[PDB]
UniProtKB/Swiss-Prot annotation:
This is Tyrosine-protein kinase Fyn. The chain holds residues 83 to 142 of 537 of the full protein. Belongs to the protein kinase superfamily. Tyr protein kinase family. SRC subfamily. Non-receptor tyrosine-protein kinase that plays a role in many biological processes including regulation of cell growth and survival, cell adhesion, integrin-mediated signaling, cytoskeletal remodeling, cell motility, immune response and axon guidance. Inactive FYN is phosphorylated on its C-terminal tail within the catalytic domain. Following activation by PKA, the protein subsequently associates with PTK2/FAK1, allowing PTK2/FAK1 phosphorylation, activation and targeting to focal adhesions. Isoform 1 is highly expressed in the brain. Isoform 2 is expressed in cells of hemopoietic lineages, especially T-lymphocytes. Residues 1-60 form the SH3 domain. Phosphorylated at tyrosine residues, which can be enhanced by NTN1. Palmitoylated. Interacts (via its SH3 domain) with PIK3R1 and PRMT8. Interacts with FYB1, PAG1, and SH2D1A. Interacts with CD79A (tyrosine-phosphorylated form); the interaction increases FYN activity. Interacts (via SH2 domain) with CSF1R (tyrosine phosphorylated). Interacts with TOM1L1 (phosphorylated form). Interacts with KDR (tyrosine phosphorylated). Interacts (via SH3 domain) with KLHL2 (via N-terminus). Interacts with SH2D1A and SLAMF1. Interacts with ITCH; the interaction phosphorylates ITCH and negatively regulates its activity. Interacts with FASLG. Interacts with RUNX3. Interacts with KIT. (Microbial infection) Interacts (via its SH3 domain) with hepatitis E virus/HEV protein ORF3. It is found in: Cytoplasm; Nucleus; Cell membrane; Perikaryon.
Amino acid sequence: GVTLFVALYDYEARTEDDLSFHKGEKFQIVNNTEGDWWLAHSLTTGETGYIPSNYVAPVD
């Protein structure tokens, strides 16, 4: 199946294409073949945008 990710820390977006998120928010990753910033889809807001991959961990 799929592997979801959870935010380890809060993050405030500083560009048009990044997401702001809170610790504990969950994501489905859309693309992670593009560097350490991953295109992700928030399960809270339904938005898609970049997140810093070191701010999340795989959900067990």
